[PDB]
């Protein structure tokens, strides 16, 4: 079973950028509902129980034919990734490792922000927007997807998460998603979390270059 992990900040720490009422509904029952529904499903099958969180997501995805447990398991992971993707007093500019990787795989940070926004702007319906690290290509990319799907099913390591589900922002912004995306990238996006996630991913991707002898 998986417990409901609280965000690493008080629910009012995102004011006024994200109101506390959104926090108490997005985590009070929205994120709690996915957690409680999954545990009931996991209490019946001893095979799905036993998998890790990433293994359960891929196993229940069933290669494009998702099992009934995929929606609950994938949404638990995404919300946990979303809370850590945001920090109080976020935004500004990423530094050091994420900085040079962004300006290599996108040309510059300015080219990255416009690409990231268009992914969220053109996302029709409830879904997610991702900044991920391609495992085979060893580069950063911006990926849009719908519903509970996360790039773990493609064996890609997420770095930054944004929720474009309506319930996440239909109170402080309602249908004004465009400025909501801009505010997230200016005051709430946590580039400190992106550093360690790109540090955890270095155990599997190795974005560096080899030392080759002259002999």
């Amino acid at each position: 079973y998986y417990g409901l992990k609280t965000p690493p900040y008080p629910l009012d720490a995102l004011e006024p950028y994200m109101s506390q009422r959104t926090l108490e509904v997005h985590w009070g029952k929205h994120h709690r509902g996915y957690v409680d529904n999954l545990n009931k499903q996991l209490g019946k099958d001893d095979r799905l129980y036993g998998y890790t969180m990433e293994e359960l997501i891929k196993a229940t995805y069933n290669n494009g034919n998702p099992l009934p447990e995929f929606n609950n398991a994938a949404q638990v992971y995404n919300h946990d990734f979303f809370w850590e993707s945001m920090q109080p007093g976020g935004g500004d500019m990423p530094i050091k490792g994420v900085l040079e990787q962004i300006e290599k795989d996108f040309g510059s940070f300015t080219n990255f922000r416009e690409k990231f926004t268009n992914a969220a702007l053109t996302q029709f319906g409830s879904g997610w927007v991702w900044l991920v690290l391609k495992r085979e290509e060893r580069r950063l990319e911006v990926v849009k997807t719908s519903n509970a799907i996360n790039p773990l099913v493609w064996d890609d390591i997420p770095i930054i998460n944004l929720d474009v589900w309506e319930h996440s922002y239909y109170l402080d912004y309602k249908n004004e998603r465009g400025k909501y995306i801009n505010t997230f990238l200016n005051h709430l996006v946590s580039w400190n979390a992106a550093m360690s996630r790109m540090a955890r991913a270095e155990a599997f991707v190795n974005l560096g270059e080899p030392t080759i002898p002259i002999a």
């Binding site: 992990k5 690493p8 494009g64 319906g125 599997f204 080759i212």
Partner: protein
């Protein structure tokens, strides 16, 4: 240039300048052939190599250097070239661990107390509790306040007792299965025989995320480092190829390391059930060659590739994309049972015709009580054969048929209905043609069922297509129907121009020409020199004359 070619060799082809430990003869051959064919050797290296051809000179040289012969031999096996920078393995905060029972407990087929299991499983929810580095100072129990008796590990103790019971119950069977399935011992296999010691941890004692203390025991150039972490199976850190050129300076046999279990797998399918990564020392920056899939066994019982690729996580076998969409194709209404129905129908009709021809045989015996001949086998109901017809050995298939599976009474009554009505039509100077019999109606209703199946499956498929296209899910199975040029550049497509010899016409000795003229001879003996009046579709023949009659 000869700087990027070397880099490309290293990256794409696994090149590395491994040290070639040479004999004095090979060293002299390399050093002396660089000067010429038959020349007075001038380069001092060649002169020294010439002197080293006699081992007595080498012994005198090493005696002058004041070292024994053994480590001079060991001096040969020294790594040449530059050395990699040393490793500064910096810990990211303190190591905070918690005894959490494995999630996969208990093993499949093993029954335990469900209440005890649920008590154990309550510990798994503790992963959600957050630990802040600014908090491990308020209640830090150090010394006699940190003794084992003061610990609260009751769920882990329940797991331990269940694990010990399972180990004592299953220990010998696992070793017998290991001997039966694994002929030879390899790192990653079960430690059996006199090498096994009591207290070795079984696989269900491990789970991904555990931190282990272990010793490096085996270095393989194509597989990686094998670490003994106190279990009956060794752990495996995947390293292969060029990475060993630098990593061999740091990962060596016998050193103690800290490793994290990344995955645990089934030892029957996967070669290395325990997959690890090095925590201390950290060599993540030095590992570039990655395993696409964990290696598996190909057992004798593996006769289907799909079952193998489903036992592990490997993709399906690809095939050429048909290029025809699945919902644009027409529905299918041919029920596979109609062929059996057709055979039963013709058998009943022939039996009825024989009964009408020779009625005296069926005297004193009920038709429903018929018996088969002594030798009628139900396991050979279809036998292939060949027969000659018009000087042609055309194939023939004999469809065996009993009488138990035939509704003789209904068929006889239906025939008597026709024969009585045929006699009435004959008495009226008229003819009666039966549109269809009962068996034909049965075939039609079975085809209606099959066509209903097709229509409902097609509508479900359309709804699936709409939902998936609105949600981005794949339409066809991923890993199947790869695009063109996947199956080799060289592909023989007869319809192409670069493979068509009909450019100046079909050769008169070509196979098609032989068949083309053969049919004309076949047709000419049927029709002759006449002219085609016109052509009409078969369904039009079905339609018009029914209106006429």
């Amino acid at each position: 240039t000869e700087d990027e070619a070397r880099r490309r060799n290293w990256i794409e082809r696994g090149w590395a300048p491994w040290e070639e430990i040479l004999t004095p003869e090979a060293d002299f051959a390399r050093k002396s052939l660089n000067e010429g064919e038959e020349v007075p050797l001038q380069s001092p290296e060649a002169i020294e190599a010439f002197k080293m051809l006699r081992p007595s000179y080498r012994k005198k040289k090493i005696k002058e250097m004041g070292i024994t012969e053994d480590e001079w031999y060991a001096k040969q096996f020294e790594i040449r070239g530059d050395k990699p920078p040393p490793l500064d393995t910096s810990w990211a905060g303190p190591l905070v661990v918690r005894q959490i029972p494995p999630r996969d407990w208990p093993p499949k087929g093993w029954e335990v107390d469900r209440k005890e299991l649920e008590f154990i499983r309550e510990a798994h929810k503790l992963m959600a509790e957050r630990v802040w580095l600014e908090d491990l100072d308020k209640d830090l129990k150090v010394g006699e306040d940190a003794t084992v008796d003061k610990m609260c590990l009751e769920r882990f103790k329940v797991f331990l007792k269940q694990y010990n019971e399972w180990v004592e119950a299953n220990k010998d069977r696992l070793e017998e299965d290991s001997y039966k399935y694994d002929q030879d011992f390899y790192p990653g296999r079960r430690i059996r025989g006199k090498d096994y010691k009591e207290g070795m941890y079984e696989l269900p004692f491990y789970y991904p995320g555990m931190i282990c203390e272990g010793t490096v025991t085996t270095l393989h150039l194509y597989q990686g480092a094998f670490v003994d972490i106190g279990g009956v199976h060794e752990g495996w850190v995947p390293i292969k190829g060029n990475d060993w050129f630098w990593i061999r300076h740091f990962i060596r046999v016998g050193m103690h390391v800290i490793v994290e279990i990344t995955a645990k797998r089934d030892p029957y399918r996967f070669r290395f059930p325990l997959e690890l990564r090095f925590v201390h020392p950290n060599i993540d920056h030095m590992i570039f060659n990655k395993f696409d899939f964990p290696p598996i066994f190909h057992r004798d019982g593996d006769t289907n590739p799909d079952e193998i690729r489903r036992d592990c996580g490997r993709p399906p076998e690809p095939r050429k994309d048909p290029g025809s969409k699945p919902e644009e194709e027409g529905l299918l209404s041919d029920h596979p049972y109609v062929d059996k129905l057709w055979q039963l129908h013709v058998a009943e009709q022939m039996i009825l015709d024989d009964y009408e021809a020779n009625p005296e045989k069926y005297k004193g015996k009920k038709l429903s009580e018929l018996s088969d001949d002594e030798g009628f086998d139900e396991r050979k109901e279809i036998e292939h054969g060949e027969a000659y017809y018009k000087k042609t050995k055309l194939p023939k298939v004999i469809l065996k048929t009993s009488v138990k599976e035939l509704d003789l009474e209904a068929a006889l009554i239906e025939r008597k209905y026709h024969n009585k009505l045929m006699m009435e039509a004959k008495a009226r100077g008229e003819g009666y043609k039966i549109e269809k019999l009962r068996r034909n109606i049965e075939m039609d209703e079975y085809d209606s069922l099959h066509w209903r199946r097709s229509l409902e499956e097609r509508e479900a498929l359309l709804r699936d297509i709409s939902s998936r296209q609105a949600l981005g899910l794949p339409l066809e199975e991923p890993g199947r129907y790869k695009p063109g040029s996947f199956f080799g550049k060289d592909q023989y497509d007869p319809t192409s121009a670069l493979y068509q010899y009909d450019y100046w016409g079909e050769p008169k000795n070509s196979e098609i020409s032989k068949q083309e003229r053969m049919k004309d001879a076949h047709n000419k003996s049927i029709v002759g020199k006449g002219n085609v009046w016109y052509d009409m579709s078969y369904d039009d023949a079905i339609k018009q004359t029914i209106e006429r009659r």
